[PDB]
Structures are given as C-alpha cells and as structure tokens.
Amino acid sequence: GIQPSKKLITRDYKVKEFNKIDAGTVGNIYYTQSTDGKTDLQIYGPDNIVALIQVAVKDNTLFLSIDKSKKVRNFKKMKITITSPTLNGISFKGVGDVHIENGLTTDNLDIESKGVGNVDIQSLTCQKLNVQSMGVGDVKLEGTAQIAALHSKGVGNIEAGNLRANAVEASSQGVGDITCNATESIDAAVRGVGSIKYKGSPTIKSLSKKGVGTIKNI
Amino acid sequence: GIQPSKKLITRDYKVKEFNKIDAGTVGNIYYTQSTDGKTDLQIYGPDNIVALIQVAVKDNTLFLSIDKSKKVRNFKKMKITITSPTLNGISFKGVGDVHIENGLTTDNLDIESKGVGNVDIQSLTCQKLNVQSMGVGDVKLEGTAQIAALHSKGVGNIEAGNLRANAVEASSQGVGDITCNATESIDAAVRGVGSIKYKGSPTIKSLSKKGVGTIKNI
Ligand SMILES: [Cl-]
Ligand SMILES: [Cl-]
C-alpha cells in the first residue's frame, strides 16, 4: 500500500472544545487535561499517513476516523496528542494504546475499549467510573473513585488494584482477570475464564462464581 | 439453586470411540492423543456438579453439555480430561480453555470456538487446518500444516506464528490480530479492528483490506 514518507510532521487541528473522544485510528493516543483552559489536537507522523486521519467535533465529541479501505505499508511513528479542560468519555475502536499519564479530575468517566491496545490512566480523581473492556488489551487504572463499575468482556485484564474506590461493581465475562480495590462494598461476578481479586475490607460484599476462576480478597 | 458439595470426585465415562469433540460445559478441557488405542473421558469436580454434565457419543462425536434445568449457586474447580486415538474436530460453545499440551497428529483438524476461553494446541502435525474463532478468546497454535485457514470473527487473537504452514488463508473480521507463518503462499484479508502479521517469504500473496489495522511481513 501507501509508503510512509520521510517528512515527519505535526499537524495542529484547532478543534472546538469537547469532553469526549471517539477514535477509530491507528496510533497511540496521549490525553492531557489542560490547566490553562485550552483545547488542542496534534497528530505527529509521516505527512502522508497523518493526512489519512479525518477529524471532527460533533455533540461535544472529538471524532477521529480513517479511510478503512486504504492500505498502508506501516503506521510507525504515529502519535496523537489530545488536550482539553474536561474529559467524561473515551470510546476507542482502533489499534494503539490510550494514555492519561499525568492525571484527570472529572465527575464521571466512561471508558469503552473496543480495539486492539491498552488503556493506561494514571492519577484519576472521579466520582463515578464506568469501564467496559470489549477488545484485545488491558485497562490499567490508578487513583480514586467513589464508585467503580468494571466490566470486562474481551481478552485482557482490568488492572485497577491501585484505583481506590468506595463501591465496586465488577463482572468478568471474557478471558482475563479483574484486580480492584473496594473500601466499603463490592459486587463481584465471575462469568468467563479468569478471576476477580480485590484489595480492602468492604463491609458489604456480593460474590457470584459462575465461570472458570475465583473471587479472592488480596 | 444447587450448592456444590465438598466431595470432589473424578467420574470416568467409558465412552465409544470418537474423533470429534462438541462441548458446551463450564470448565477447562485437556485433550491427549492416546498411543495405546484407548478412548477415555474423565470429569473432575464436586460430585453434584459433575452429575449435571450430559455425556453422549453420537456418530463419532463426543457431546458434552450442561443440564440447564437445575440452577447452580457457585461453580467450583472443574476439569475435563479427554483422550482418543484420533481427533479431527473441536467445537466449543461453553466457558473454559481447551488444551492439547502434548501434540496431535491428524490429517484434517477443524477448530470452531463459539464460547468464552482460549484454545492452545502445541506440537500439531496436520495436512489441513481450519480455524473459525467466533467467541471471546485466543487460539494459540504451534506445529506444522500444509494448509492453514485462520478466520477470526469474535474478540481475540489467533497466535499461529509458530505454526509453520505452506499455504495460509487468513481473515480477521472481529477485534484482534492474526499472527501466522506462510512459507509458500498467503491470502490475507483485514476486515475488522486488528492486523495480520505473517512470518516467511511466500512466493504468492493476495492482500485485501477494509478495516482498522494492517498486513505486515514480520
Ligand atoms: Cl492492578
Ligand atoms: Cl504467535
């Protein structure tokens, strides 16, 4: 297919403000919560590969898409850098890893991973967290939540042992484990191949083992 | 609901010879190709849970299924051990991993995974291999094949980089990657979210694309 050019560029897209990301691209994504009220989108890589990404903001959502019929020899060097003052949702349906390396403070965060790649969120501070992992890859979470709903359905692990939550709702239906941390309550259901491990001494627990694996307090 | 008993048993079923497995059970399966002409089926678990598994051999197929008329509270560890002189097919629609740890020599092998769990086949020697993955899980394959048809439609990877085949037919329509090894020819079609990676220097290649990912020689 398309031979990536030797001219490595950064394309800056002055997009409208958004609080949600919906991406069907190839390449790693790095999200930063802005501290100066700015919204920005930068795409780094070979100029003829960067040119394949279509960008639009609609209903407070940043949509990143590609012409799926386009053959590319390789997607090496592709880096998508996203920044906005707020973030409430990530819907990922491409190939690559999604990062929040330096924190996110939000009320509600909804993570929907339906692609090939990992999700790694560090220093998260939220009220409600909802994770639906449905693709191939791991979802790594660190920080705090009042409520954390962790639902794994694809192939991979939810690594949320360092995500301190008061109430946890965990269900494992694919292939992989859920590691979590519940200080007050835990509703855990094993329904696939894999186990649910939880830190803490929750007052209320509701456990259901209906697959291949176990529920263990660690 | 049935409470699993504390009496863990192994039940031995002296079944008729079969060359196909069709299982809709909960629990890991371990298949062994016998070298002494024997056919055997053993099921390990709580005795009142083992008693829920329906076993029948019909037209050379071992059928394993759950009597779903009796609700079960919690599942405890289950293990299904299967042995026969030959194996030409595995159809899985339950919950659990399917293993062939110590090899299989066959003419044609047909793998149909519709459930939740992995398929891990080591030291495979066959003429024709057909894999149709439609559930949640990975299909891991090692050994040799003259022809390998690898069709992924669910969520998970086909890990066949150590399966040396002369001709490969690979298509990915779900979420996940196909890693394979084609020495003479490769027909590859990316139609979902994920990539097709192939080892070798095939003489003939046909590469088709309408998805999110790529086709790469590794
Ligand atoms: Cl963890
Ligand atoms: Cl592999």
Side-chain angles (χ1 to χ4, degrees), chain A residues 1-6 8-13 15-72 74-208 210-218, chain B residues 1-5 7-13 15-69 72 74-218:
Chain A
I2 296 170
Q3 250 297 86
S5 83
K6 212 211 168 178
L8 307 179
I9 67 140
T10 297
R11 185 161 168 180
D12 187 19
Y13 312 76
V15 294
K16 281 198 201 161
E17 188 175 341
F18 56 83
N19 64 346
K20 294 178 285 293
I21 300 155
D22 187 303
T25 49
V26 181
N28 295 326
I29 297 167
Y30 295 85
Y31 173 83
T32 302
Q33 176 174 39
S34 65
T35 58
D36 56 11
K38 287 189 183 313
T39 297
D40 194 49
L41 173 69
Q42 305 190 331
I43 302 170
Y44 176 85
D47 57 359
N48 59 341
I49 309 308
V50 168
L52 300 179
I53 302 177
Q54 299 98 36
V55 172
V57 174
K58 170 151 45 182
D59 46 69
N60 294 328
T61 311
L62 173 67
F63 290 95
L64 307 172
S65 58
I66 63 155
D67 176 356
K68 296 173 188 166
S69 294
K70 283 275 152 267
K71 287 173 209 180
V72 177
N74 71 74
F75 296 93
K76 288 199 258 85
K77 292 160 191 282
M78 290 303 298
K79 193 205 278 185
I80 300 158
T81 293
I82 310 181
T83 182
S84 70
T86 68
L87 193 71
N88 294 118
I90 305 166
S91 181
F92 185 80
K93 307 175 256 250
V95 171
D97 300 328
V98 183
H99 299 262
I100 308 184
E101 301 185 302
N102 293 299
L104 173 65
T105 302
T106 190
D107 37 26
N108 311 296
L109 180 64
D110 188 13
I111 307 148
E112 308 281 307
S113 53
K114 313 141 81 77
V116 181
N118 300 324
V119 179
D120 190 337
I121 297 162
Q122 304 174 242
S123 311
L124 175 63
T125 307
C126 69
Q127 300 309 301
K128 298 175 184 177
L129 170 69
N130 186 60
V131 177
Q132 296 269 347
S133 61
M134 293 169 275
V136 178
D138 295 344
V139 178
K140 189 173 176 192
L141 306 154
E142 184 277 329
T144 68
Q146 284 293 334
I147 304 155
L150 309 175
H151 307 293
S152 56
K153 297 166 175 180
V155 178
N157 299 331
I158 299 183
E159 297 163 345
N162 298 321
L163 181 93
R164 293 134 260 144
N166 281 322
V168 169
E169 293 141 21
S171 174
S172 59
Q173 294 175 278
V175 177
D177 298 333
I178 301 173
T179 304
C180 58
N181 190 335
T183 75
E184 293 177 347
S185 68
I186 185 157
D187 198 315
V190 158
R191 297 285 191 273
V193 183
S195 302
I196 300 168
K197 285 161 284 183
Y198 64 96
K199 292 183 191 172
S201 301
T203 298
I204 314 278
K205 61 183 160 215
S206 191
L207 317 171
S208 181
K210 282 169 163 89
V212 184
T214 194
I215 302 167
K216 196 192 287 158
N217 185 193
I218 57 147
Chain B
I2 297 171
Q3 249 303 302
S5 82
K7 185 143 177 264
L8 308 179
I9 66 140
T10 296
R11 175 165 172 196
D12 186 19
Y13 311 76
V15 294
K16 284 193 177 240
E17 196 168 329
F18 56 83
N19 65 345
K20 293 178 170 63
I21 299 155
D22 186 304
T25 42
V26 177
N28 293 336
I29 296 168
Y30 294 86
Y31 172 83
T32 301
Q33 177 173 39
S34 61
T35 59
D36 56 12
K38 289 186 182 195
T39 296
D40 192 50
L41 172 68
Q42 295 199 343
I43 302 170
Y44 175 86
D47 57 358
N48 59 342
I49 309 308
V50 168
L52 303 178
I53 299 179
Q54 297 154 339
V55 174
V57 174
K58 167 151 45 168
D59 247 15
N60 301 298
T61 298
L62 174 66
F63 292 95
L64 307 174
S65 63
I66 319 157
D67 169 38
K68 293 183 160 195
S69 73
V72 180
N74 292 315
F75 274 92
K76 285 197 200 172
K77 187 81 206 156
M78 305 288 303
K79 195 205 278 180
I80 299 157
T81 294
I82 311 182
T83 188
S84 71
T86 67
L87 193 72
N88 293 118
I90 305 165
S91 180
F92 187 78
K93 55 227 75 186
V95 175
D97 296 334
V98 178
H99 297 272
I100 303 175
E101 303 184 303
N102 293 298
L104 172 65
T105 302
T106 190
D107 37 26
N108 312 295
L109 179 64
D110 188 12
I111 309 163
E112 306 283 307
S113 51
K114 296 168 253 278
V116 179
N118 299 328
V119 178
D120 192 336
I121 297 162
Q122 309 167 46
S123 312
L124 175 64
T125 306
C126 70
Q127 301 308 301
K128 194 226 168 192
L129 170 69
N130 185 61
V131 174
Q132 295 269 349
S133 63
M134 299 160 270
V136 178
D138 293 346
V139 176
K140 190 172 177 192
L141 306 154
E142 184 278 328
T144 67
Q146 284 292 333
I147 305 157
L150 308 174
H151 308 292
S152 58
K153 296 164 177 180
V155 176
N157 298 335
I158 299 184
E159 299 160 339
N162 298 320
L163 181 93
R164 304 127 235 159
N166 281 321
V168 168
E169 287 144 47
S171 71
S172 56
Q173 295 171 276
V175 176
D177 298 334
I178 301 174
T179 304
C180 57
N181 190 334
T183 74
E184 294 176 346
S185 70
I186 185 156
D187 198 315
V190 157
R191 292 295 192 277
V193 181
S195 303
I196 298 168
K197 290 169 267 178
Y198 64 96
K199 293 182 191 173
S201 297
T203 297
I204 318 269
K205 62 183 161 93
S206 191
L207 316 173
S208 190
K209 160 103 187 282
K210 199 201 186 165
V212 182
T214 193
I215 302 167
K216 197 193 288 157
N217 184 13
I218 58 147

